Design an enzyme around this catalytic site. Structure first.
Site, PDB file in Angstrom:
ATOM      1  N   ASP A  31      40.869  33.101  32.634  1.00  0.00           N
ATOM      2  CA  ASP A  31      40.628  33.085  34.076  1.00  0.00           C
ATOM      3  C   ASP A  31      39.271  32.456  34.388  1.00  0.00           C
ATOM      4  O   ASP A  31      38.254  33.135  34.337  1.00  0.00           O
ATOM      5  CB  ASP A  31      40.641  34.485  34.706  1.00  0.00           C
ATOM      6  CG  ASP A  31      40.728  34.462  36.230  1.00  0.00           C
ATOM      7  OD1 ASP A  31      40.846  33.359  36.789  1.00  0.00           O
ATOM      8  OD2 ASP A  31      40.703  35.548  36.856  1.00  0.00           O
ATOM      9  N   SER A  32      39.274  31.181  34.777  1.00  0.00           N
ATOM     10  CA  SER A  32      38.066  30.457  35.155  1.00  0.00           C
ATOM     11  C   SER A  32      37.556  30.849  36.551  1.00  0.00           C
ATOM     12  O   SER A  32      36.481  30.423  37.002  1.00  0.00           O
ATOM     13  CB  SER A  32      38.348  28.999  35.119  1.00  0.00           C
ATOM     14  OG  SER A  32      39.372  28.717  36.065  1.00  0.00           O
TER      15      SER A  32
END
Lengths: 113, 113
Positions: A20-21
């Protein structure tokens, strides 16, 4: 579309890390914390936040990284690999090969299975 | 850690796209929808969801992609580039070079400025 997951060992336990950026901080559910024998590690001077784990061992492929975790009471994912770690390791999310490049490791994202 | 943003034109308007692999669907704030003259495009048969935009033009570098947007009433980011688009374009998030590779384009992430 299926979300992005990789296999990792945290403190010698095999888990599935949601990559999850859009997340500042790597976090883990309280239920996951239990499942990894990490509750003892939790610094309760932080706090709905259960606490912070200052040092934990990440095993990705045949590589080992120290990292910190923030433990949440209830969370949608059990373990969330965040931008903190991604940026720290100048990791590459390659959705062409469908894998995470983190140093000398290239780990594939899991299929829906 | 600063979040990931790139420059893009949506329907000929220059904006800042928050890149987020932990998001299923590309979305936009109602305030951003206004700011891009996109309110007319909104299919209100969807719905807190304001609606859906079936076709919008994305300009990234000197490339052009059709894409859909989901418009939300209030949202933390104004425009969120999602996994839908990332996976569709087999884009590569390279935090080694600090850029987004999407076909023949390589676009740098913005600094805090």
């Amino acid at each position: 579309v299926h979300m992005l997951y990789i296999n990792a060992e945290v403190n010698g336990i095999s888990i599935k890390a949601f990559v999850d950026s859009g997340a500042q901080t790597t976090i883990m559910s309280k239920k996951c914390a239990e499942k990894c024998n990490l509750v003892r590690l939790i610094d309760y001077r932080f706090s709905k936040i259960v606490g912070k784990i200052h040092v934990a061992q990440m095993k990705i492929g045949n590589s080992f990284f120290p990292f910190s975790i923030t433990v949440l009471e209830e969370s949608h994912v059990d373990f969330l690999f965040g931008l903190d770690l991604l940026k720290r390791y100048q990791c590459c999310i390659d959705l062409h090969q469908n894998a995470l490049i983190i140093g000398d490791e290239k780990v594939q994202f899991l299929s829906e299975s």
